[PDB]
Amino acid sequence: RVFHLCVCDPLDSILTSQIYNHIEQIAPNIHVMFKSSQNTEHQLRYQETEFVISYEDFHRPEFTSVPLFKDEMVLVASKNHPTIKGPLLKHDVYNEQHAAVSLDRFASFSQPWYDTVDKQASIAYQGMAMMSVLSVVSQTHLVAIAPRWLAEEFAESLELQVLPLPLKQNSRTCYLSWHEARDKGHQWMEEQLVSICKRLE
Amino acid sequence: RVFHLCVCDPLDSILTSQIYNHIEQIAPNIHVMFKSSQNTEHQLRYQETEFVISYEDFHRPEFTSVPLFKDEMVLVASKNHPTIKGPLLKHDVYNEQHAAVSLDRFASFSQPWYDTVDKQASIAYQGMAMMSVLSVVSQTHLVAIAPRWLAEEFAESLELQVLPLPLKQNSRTCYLSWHEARDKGHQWMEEQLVSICKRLE
User: Which biological process annotations from GO are given for this protein (chains A, B)?
Assistant: First the structure.
């Protein structure tokens, strides 16, 4: 039995290792495959994907979304930054140079905070994934917006300072979603995923 | 003057910080913007992109490709792996579980080593970028194929062992490409990029 999960970036960098390590320990015929990339409805219904973990909530009755956890969104910068020695004021955020997840990406994590021409002009680097964004931030004077859990996990490794985000959209809730249609394996996997993620909390 | 570069993953994680840090020091009206994502011809000719850095070589006369450096491709695994305590034999490589860059990605770095159904079945995690792949490898028993320079840069931070790749396609050359058509700024930037990359060598 192979379970196909789509864990959207950057939630894959937060949750994948925890899910994989726990579900690998169970049995030799139980496996879990991960993607991080069609729309959710096409993925769930018409493709192997059985679960989606993302920041998007489905109130659509044919689908069921379960909230997993809420997290703060933070600004990150190198601990070696020449000028940033603490939190930025609201009016200075976009006077820095930013690294962000490519806005061309299908479900870009960064899109909510660069929804104007002015804000987008501050982006000097667009990477494919948040871990690419964090690695460039750790080697440059660029700043980025990331989930607090991810930033704190790699703060020591990549030498990052983790700062409050003085924007109003400073939190996000990630959800577990699936198509309500449902064998025993799928019901079982639902409860394991909910427990793994909430246990990490 | 703003220069638009497309540095294809994982070469952005190798080169972006070096290019940005050097070209930022120069002047306040000289800037460089990075993407890592149309085809190269559309990007170069018909879009803001002025240079492409990738593992692809253009012998097409209208375009000019300059080799920057050759690098070894290696296997990476967590230093905490329960069984991997050295290089893998050719016949054991694909008996491990792999993390790789999504094969759906336009120019997936990992595609050359997963070109069969058998090889692809060994992939348990598909991420959007090589830095996402390395971070999951550092937290799991999964293995991945990465450029040696990138693996060695983060070997200590992410606690990775860097192993020879017993495959025949174990090296790649990255090139600087552009559309031969060419102001003084573009000619200048060409020489800086060649010097920055070869200096890093």
Answer: regulation of DNA-templated transcription
Closest residue in B to A4 (Cα) is B124
Kindly provide the residue ranges of all beta strands, DSSP E only, lying in chain A, ordered along the sequence: 2-7, 31-35, 51-54, 63-78, 98-101, 123-127, 144-147, 160-164, 171-179
Cβ neighbour number for residue B81 with a 10 Å cutoff: 16
A132:B13 CB<8 A? yes
Q: Is A107 on the interface with B (CB under 8 A)?
A: no
> CA-nearest residue of chain B to A127?
B36
Measured between beta carbons, which residues in chain B are less than 8 angstroms from residue A121?
A: none
Distance CA B73, CA A174 (A): 36
Give the count of Cβ contacts less than 8 A between chain A and B. Answer: 121
**Chain A contact for B132, CB < 8 A?**
yes
Q: Which amino acid is at A56?
A: E
Asked if the C-beta of B71 comes within 8 angstroms of chain A's C-beta atoms, the answer is no
For chain A, how big is the Rg over CA atoms in Å? 18
Query: Which of B104, B124, B127 faces A129 most closely, judged by CB atoms?
Result: B127
For residue B65, the one-letter residue type is S
Segments of chain B assigned E as strands: 2-7, 31-35, 51-54, 63-78, 98-101, 123-127, 144-147, 160-164, 171-179
In angstroms, rounded to a whole number, what is the distance separating the alpha carbons of residues A161 and A138? 9
Cβ atoms B50, B178 nearer than 8 A: yes
Quote the CA–CA distance of A16 and A54 in Å, as a whole number.
12
Please give the C-alpha separations between residue B99 and each of A182, B113, B161, in angstroms, as whole numbers: 29, 12, 15
CB of B51 closer than 8 Å to CB of B178: yes
Q: What does this entry list as its resolution, in Å?
A: 1.9
Cα atoms in the Cβ-side hemisphere of radius 13 Å centred on A124? 23
Give the total residue count for chain A.
Answer: 201
Q: How far apart are CA A136 and CA A58, in angstroms?
A: 34
Q: Measured between alpha carbons, how far is B101 from B10 in angstroms, rounded to an integer?
A: 9
Task: Tell whether A126 is within 8 A of chain B (Cβ).
Answer: yes
**Cβ atoms of residues B1 and B26 within 8 Å:** no
